[PDB]
């Protein structure tokens, strides 16, 4: 079985190896399409502490094609790591990052204490704490208005029943596992009425001549003997057909 050279791979490294991680309430969404999804590299990588795939087999997701891949990347606490799951509830699951119950995709989370935690406390990550209602699945809310717990208007002034909806994380190297910062990226697979150019890598095998073999060139499959050809093809043509509709 033979396929063209694997090129134009999806920029998965640009998300996982990003120098900055988005906030829980302001998770960074990246779209990947028309590229080779090197899913096996992430699957075999041991740098991830949590690797949960819903609706797709972790060992066979490279064989699944989707219209697009949406990478939602953020930094959260360890205790909130379990909150990133379909059907889950919590502060982050309802106000910062909400996942649908029937979500299809893979969530990969890894501790980033050595990279995100700071001695003085890394407060650059903020999560929504107070909100009027639970956020919709895959909904990004970044409103900074002071939350009004009661009927008294805040008028831009903090006070009774007027608390800031966003809370910062106390990420420190001396913090516990549940309090240590962890970077979580959820790859959601969107499949609509599209050609779905986003696909995983295709295996390639060494070529054999002058022997009955089962050959698979891209979409053309058959069995026969492959020999050197003296014919000339047009640059855009891939295979030649005989007068009896036979390759």
């Amino acid at each position, epitope marked *: 079985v033979r396929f063209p050279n694997i090129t134009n791979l999806c920029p998965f490294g640009e998300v996982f190896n990003a120098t900055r991680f988005a906030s829980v309430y302001a998770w960074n969404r990246k779209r990947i399409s028309n590229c080779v999804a090197d899913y096996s590299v992430l699957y075999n990588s041991a740098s991830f502490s949590t690797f949960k795939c819903y609706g797709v087999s972790p060992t066979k997701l490279n064989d699944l094609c989707f219209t697009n891949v949406y990478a939602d990347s953020f930094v959260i606490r360890g205790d909130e790591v379990r909150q990133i799951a379909p059907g889950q509830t919590g502060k982050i699951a309802d106000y910062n990052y909400k996942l649908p119950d029937d979500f299809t995709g893979c969530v990969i989370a890894w501790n980033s204490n050595n990279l995100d935690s700071k001695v003085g406390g890394n407060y650059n990550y903020l999560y929504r*704490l*107070f909100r009027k209602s639970n956020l919709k699945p895959f909904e990004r809310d970044i409103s900074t208005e002071i939350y009004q717990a*009661g009927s008294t208007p805040c008028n831009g002034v903090e006070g*009774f*029943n007027c*608390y800031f909806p966003l*809370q910062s994380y106390g990420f420190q190297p001396t913090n516990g596992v549940g309090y240590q910062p962890y970077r979580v990226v959820v790859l959601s697979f969107e499949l609509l009425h599209a050609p779905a150019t986003v696909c995983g890598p295709k295996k390639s095998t060494n070529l054999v001549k002058n022997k009955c073999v089962n050959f698979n060139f891209n979409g053309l499959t058959g069995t026969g003997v492959l020999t050197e050809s003296n014919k000339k093809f047009l640059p855009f043509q891939q295979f030649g057909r005989d007068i009896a509709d036979t390759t």
Partner: antibody
Amino acid sequence: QMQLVQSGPEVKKPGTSVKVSCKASGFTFTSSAVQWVRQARGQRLEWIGWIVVGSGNTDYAQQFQERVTITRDMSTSTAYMELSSLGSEDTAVYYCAAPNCSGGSCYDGFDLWGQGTMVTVSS
Amino acid sequence: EIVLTQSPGTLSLSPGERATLSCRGSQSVRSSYLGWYQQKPGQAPRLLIYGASSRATGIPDRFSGSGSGTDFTLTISRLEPEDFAVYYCQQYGSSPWTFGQGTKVEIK
């Protein structure tokens, strides 16, 4: 209605950094503030301050800095406040109060009570 | 900071008659963030009036509170044995919090 829980009787000696907790039940203790009050025996009371339990944001008086500090515990939903450098004339009782309101869309007042912590000092 | 002073100390009034209590501040405050609240001699305080126009939960209709500018007042038309208490005046907007100065409505 809600229900606040504090410590009970307390007899101490001057100079001891006293430690008092205040927990809540019956309403969402997620990020609602907690306001603290001290009052001597039959004597008029004055202002201690308040704490934002969601992020642990402390606010106190001009006289209660560098001697009071308060921490947060979401596990038992308790505000843990301590005093340092007390005095022999500081016999009083301490109360805590959260905005009395049920749910996320609730009222505004501070209606209900805790249990009260009696601090008695002698010698 | 802002400092308030309230009705003077140890005033005794006969039960069943009108009682009025006053609170005045050196600096102007906002009425939308105002509150008068009661405290028994030996028990935690209780909110009575907030905003000078809204009656607080659990408060009888006979209690009323009002005022404007720097001068605010609290009135009870008929005194009950549940009126032997101390009343407090406070504003609760931004960072300054000014708790009550104390006014004991007593029993003859």
